[PDB]
């Protein structure tokens, strides 16, 4: 029941830094690599009294990779895991896809094969990358293409990060987003959307942190991934595997873009006065103010909904809460899907980390849905891309790296076809 995670770019490996710290603290593995069988899906019993994470951290720039190498977890990671190039893609999809990407792609794929060889019950892959940059967008695209042609139907979960609409950190990022989504549409099995301003709002509102850094965002992402993979790791009353998500959450092969939500996100003090139970945190997992992508599901229809429960949770109260939600009319399900809910319960309560902001919570919910607000997200990105492409701005860089303007167009009509598909499905 092993799963290997690939981290592409700076953001991917920072998310991995949070995730692996959480994993090591959760299974009792010390940073040196020794415990003082649930660990089998992330760690491997190597030699005697040693565990090595099943992960490859790949980036084209050394700064962050050897910062990870020099940190506390020197011994935990095998030295051959942390792949590092010599020069950066420099926010250039074409550069990281044709120029520097080709050189480092072969080494990563051979390492992936060795991890897969040990993996006897490999459930699937799950990726981390940010499409705004060059390495996470350019090299990630080629890596997914060759990983798919190597395996074909193996599950590759996408925990990607699209640029946020109003706030962003670059100028050339719409081009990278479009040229990466053209392949993320057809090569990713399940994609989980993750926006930055939404997590900023979540931290400002719920965790009342007025000055949040990327560390809190990565910690929340790690909490989501842990609550998602606890069914693989720890036993519950009613667990679900990776194939469950594809089977019960993907109505059509071209529609895999999942909104993420988690509850309860609470501080230590506000945990004193809120009656923390199962029903109201399920209610809090459906409001747009507690979603990880700034989109309004009120504008769309739910094709399906998934629910992950952890802690002291029984089927009775989750069934009651699902019935209560189905009786509500604030959110509406699509007509062709009359049973758009799927529940899952795990015994293991969520863990806490020293220095973290989340309180010790005895029951938590991780929500993964599928609505059509992603449709307006795509069009909102497309309008900004088309504004830039009308004057042929920054195109000369990509043309110089080796690609031509035909890719830009074909990606534009690919997005247009996707918009039409999402509009037709919601009817």
């Amino acid at each position: 029941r092993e799963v290997i995670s690939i981290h592409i770019g700076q953001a991917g490996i920072q998310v991995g830094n949070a995730c692996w710290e959480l994993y090591c603290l959760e299974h009792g593995i010390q940073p040196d690599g020794q415990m003082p069988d649930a660990f089998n899906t992330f760690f491997s019993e190597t030699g005697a009294g040693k565990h090595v994470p099943r992960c490859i951290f790949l980036d084209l720039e050394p700064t962050v990779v050897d910062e990870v190498r020099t940190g506390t977890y020197r011994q935990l990671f095998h030295p051959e895991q942390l792949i590092s190039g010599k020069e950066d893609a420099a926010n250039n999809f074409a550069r990281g896809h044709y120029t520097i990407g080709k050189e480092i792609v072969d080494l990563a794929l051979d390492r992936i094969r060795k991890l897969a060889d040990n993996c006897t019950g490999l459930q699937g892959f799950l990726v981390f990358n940010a499409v705004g940059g060059g390495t996470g967008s350019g090299l990630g695209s080629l890596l997914l293409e060759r990983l798919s042609v190597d395996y074909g139907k193996k599950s590759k979960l996408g925990f990607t990060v699209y640029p946020s609409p109003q706030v962003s950190t670059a100028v050339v990022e719409p081009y990278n987003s479009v040229l990466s989504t053209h392949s993320l549409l057809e090569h990713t099995d399940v994609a989980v959307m993750l926006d930055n301003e939404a997590i900023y709002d979540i931290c400002r509102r719920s965790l009342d942190i007025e000055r949040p850094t990327y560390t809190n965002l990565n910690r929340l992402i790690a909490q989501v991934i842990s609550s998602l993979t606890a069914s693989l790791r720890f036993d519950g009353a009613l667990n679900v595997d990776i194939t469950e998500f594809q089977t019960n959450l993907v109505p059509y092969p071209r529609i895999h873009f999942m909104l993420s939500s988690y509850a309860p996100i609470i501080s230590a003090e506000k945990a004193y006065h809120e009656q923390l139970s199962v029903a109201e945190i399920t209610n809090a997992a459906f409001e747009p103010a507690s979603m990880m992508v700034k989109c309004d599901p009120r504008h769309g229809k739910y094709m399906a909904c998934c629910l992950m429960y952890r802690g002291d949770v029984v089927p009775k109260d989750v069934n009651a809460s699902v019935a209560t939600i189905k009786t509500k009319r604030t959110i509406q399900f699509v007509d062709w899907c009359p049973t758009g809910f799927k529940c899952g319960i795990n015994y293991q309560p969520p863990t806490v980390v020293p220095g973290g902001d989340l309180a010790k919570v005895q029951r938590a919910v991780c929500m993964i849905s599928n609505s059509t607000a992603i449709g307006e997200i795509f069009s909102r990105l497309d309008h900004k891309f088309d504004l830039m492409y009308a004057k042929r701005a920054f195109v000369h860089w990509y043309v110089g790296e080796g690609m031509e303007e035909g890719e830009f167009s074909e990606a534009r009509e690919d997005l247009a076809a996707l918009e039409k598909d999402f509009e037709e499905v919601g009817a």
């Binding site: 029941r1 069988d37 649930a38 069914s231 693989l232 790791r233 720890f234 036993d235 519950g236 009353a237 009613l238 667990n239 679900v240 595997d241 230590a268 003090e269 945990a271 004193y272 009656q275 923390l276 139970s277 199962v278 002291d312 949770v313 029984v314 109260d317 015994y347 806490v352 020293p354 220095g355 902001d357 309180a359 010790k360 005895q362 029951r363």
Partner: protein
């Protein structure tokens, strides 16, 4: 469970904590909450101390 099975079907701790319906409805770890609160207070103390 569907894939793994570590805790048995009649764990005394699990059965005790699930049978007390009040714990399922509401449950806290007050000492740890106080520890987190003091950790937060110490962090803003250290921040303003660096500023000072």
């Amino acid at each position: 469970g569907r894939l793994v099975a570590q805790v048995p079907n009649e764990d005394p701790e699990r059965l005790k904590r699930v049978l007390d319906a009040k714990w399922r409805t509401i449950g806290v770890d007050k000492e740890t909450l106080e520890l987190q609160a003091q950790e937060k207070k110490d962090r803003e103390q250290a921040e303003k101390d660096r500023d000072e």
